[PDB]
Amino acid sequence: RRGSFVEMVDNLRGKSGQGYYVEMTVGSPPQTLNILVDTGSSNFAVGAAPHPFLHRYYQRQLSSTYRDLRKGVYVPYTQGKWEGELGTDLVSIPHGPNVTVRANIAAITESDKFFINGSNWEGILGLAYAEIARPDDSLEPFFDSLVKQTHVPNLFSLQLCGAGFPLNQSEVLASVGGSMIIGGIDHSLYTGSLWYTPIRREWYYEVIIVRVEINGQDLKMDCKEYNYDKSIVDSGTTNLRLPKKVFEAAVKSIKAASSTEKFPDGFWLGEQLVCWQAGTTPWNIFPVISLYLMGEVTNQSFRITILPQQYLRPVEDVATSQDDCYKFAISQSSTGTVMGAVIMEGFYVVFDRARKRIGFAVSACHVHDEFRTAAVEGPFVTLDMEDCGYN
Ligand SMILES: NC1=N[C@@]2([C@@H]3C[C@H]3NC(=O)c3ccc(F)cn3)COC[C@H]2CS1
Ligand SMILES: NC1=N[C@@]2([C@H]3C[C@@H]3NC(=O)c3ccc(F)cn3)COC[C@H]2CS1
């Protein structure tokens, strides 16, 4: 396999806890900003005023190409809020396609628990569809503009690369965190075959899960439960998030599989770190988790399998400690399944918008051990898969 997108390989930095970001420029002359790659939202929004956690921000007054749309936007969400002023400007991705686009930009003027101290990013690139744009679906998302204005194919792909150990801010800045290939698939970024699941509807990147196993054991829930009220692929969420009832069942199963060691309730609630002596993390006691996804062929599914090296997120205790420490990166949701960054770190994920499908392959950068790897495998005969979708 040849890698045909060398200019875009290794263009991301970051980590699952704080997000993966790409360098972009906005305005004339170009203003460089680091931008979070977010497949779970649809606005391009950048810091545009001083904030304690921003080293730089978009200065509209210094851009000759800035256009004011004379419209505000207020975006409250569960864990925070941002508000800003809409406009358009010329945008480029230096380690991207060799093109400049005029795109909508929300200039963020006030925010709460949005920016992350030490994350290094100064804005967000919402890569999902117009239906979920704010303030409404008339605000064309960045990727839509890119495809309309250029010859870039209507597809992008993400390889998010977790280190398998903690990185500080200085280390993140100096390290490669993955690849966003805009307009194509780079065959150097995965091993084995790509398997595709349909995009159920173009809003979020919505998919359908048809079976869940923990170490090969069927969780045995009605498949609608896995997709209640949706299942999405979201690079802008850290954890694998599961609907309450599925979370409860899965945690019970994972506890049972790992029962040779007892962990505190705070660990399973995703709040508390657990630590082992350097090098002694007992990966083998934790189970693999398989999610079966609807295939493109009638009555066919395939599965993706992750390791504890994906769902246990490395965290530092103290800079002086030599212990290997982790948080449990599966958590409950009241808004459906979210296949977040820790899941995506296992896989090369192809967002094939043109063909309304998402591809998964084993990532060439996934963390594993001598005994087990992540997997993407198929096919399986599966009936009545459409019925697994929630209405
Ligand atoms: N694909 C295969 N899978 C196996 C294990 C899961 C792979 N890991 C390795 O080969 C390996 C080698 C050196 C190292 F530092 C870390 N890992 C499981 O079955 C046979 C073994 C070799 S080939
Ligand atoms: N995908 C959504 N996107 C939003 C972005 C801001 C949040 N994501 C993050 O901070 C973040 C943190 C760690 C990661 F690995 C990835 N992302 C934007 O809309 C609201 C918020 C909710 S979840």
What is the CATH code of the structural domain delimited by 153-391? 2.40.70.10
Name the residue ranges covered by the structural domains of the chain: 20-152, 153-391
C-alpha distances out from residue 144 to 34, 56, 71, 176, Å: 20, 27, 20, 27
370 Cβ closer than 6 Å to some ligand 1 atom? yes
- Helix (DSSP H) and strand (DSSP E) numbers for the chain: 6, 25
Q: Look at residue 68 and give its three-state secondary structure.
A: strand
The label of the residue with tokens 């045909």 reads: 4
The 3-state DSSP class for residue 251 equals helix
Going from the C-alpha of 202 to that of each of 128, 131, 257, the distances in angstroms are 8, 8, 37
Please, what is the Cα angle at 375 between 370 and 380, to 5 degrees? 140
**Alpha carbon nearest to ligand 1 atom 19, residue:** 371
The DSSP secondary-structure symbol of 386 reads G
- How far apart are the C-alpha atoms of 341 and 159, rounded to whole Å? 10
- Pairwise CA distance, residues 193 & 304, whole Å: 12
Sheet holding 312-315, edge to edge: 274-276, 324-328, 312-315
Catalytic residue ranges: 38, 234
What spacing in Å lies between the alpha carbon of 315 and ligand 1's midpoint? 25
CB of 345 shorter than 6 A to ligand 2: no
Q: Is the CB of 16 under 6 A from ligand 2?
A: yes
DSSP 374: -
CATH architecture of residue range(s) 20-152: Beta Barrel (2.40)
For residues 276 and 287, give the distance between their C-alpha atoms in angstroms, rounded to a whole number: 18
Nearest listed ligand to the Cα of residue 53: 2
Using CA atoms, how far apart are residues 257 and 250, in angstroms rounded to an integer?
Answer: 11
Q: Give me ligand 1 centre to Cα 154, in Å.
A: 36
At CA 341, angle to CA 337 and CA 342, rounded to 5? 90
Fold matches, 20-152 and 153-391 = yes
Ligand 2 pocket test, pick from 13, 21, 38 with the greatest ligand atom count within 8 Å of Cβ, gives 38
H or E element, residue 309: helix 308-311
The residue whose two tokens read 């209640």 is 228
Distance of CA 337 to the CA centre of its chain: 13
Instruction: Provide the sign of the torsion angle of the four alpha carbons 327, 328, 333, 339, taken in this order.
Output: positive
Is 371 a pocket residue for ligand 1 (Cβ < 6 Å)?
Answer: yes
Sign of CA dihedral 69, 72, 75, 81: positive
Measured in Å, residue 372 CA sits from the centre of ligand 1 at: 7
CA distance 187 to 98: 20
Kindly give the distance from the C-alpha atom of residue 366 to the centroid of ligand 1, in angstroms, as a whole number: 13
Task: Determine if ligand 2 sits within 6 Å of the CB of residue 38.
Answer: yes
| Nearest ligand atom owner, CA of 45 | 2
Give the CA radius of gyration of the chain.
21
Please identify, by atom number, the ligand 1 atom nearest to the C-alpha of residue 372.
6
Among residues 329, 229, 182, 320, which one has the least CA distance to residue 269? 329
Nearest to 233 by CA among 104, 351, 129: 351
- Produce one character per residue of 311-324: b if its CB has 16 or more CB atoms within 10 Å, e if not: bbbbbeeeeeeebb
Distance CA(351)–CA(199), nearest Å, equals: 9
Provide DSSP, 95-164.
TS-S-EEEEEEEEEEEEES-S-TTS---EEEE-S-GGG-SS-TTS--HHHHHHHHSS--S-EEEEE---S
Q: Residues for the chain: how many in total?
A: 391
Can you read off the two tokens belonging to residue 110? 């006030």
Cα-Cα-Cα-Cα dihedral of 336, 339, 342, 343, to 10°? 140
The structure tokens listed for 135 are 């303030």
Question: CB of 372 closer than 6 A to ligand 1?
Answer: yes
d(CA 57, CA 48): 5
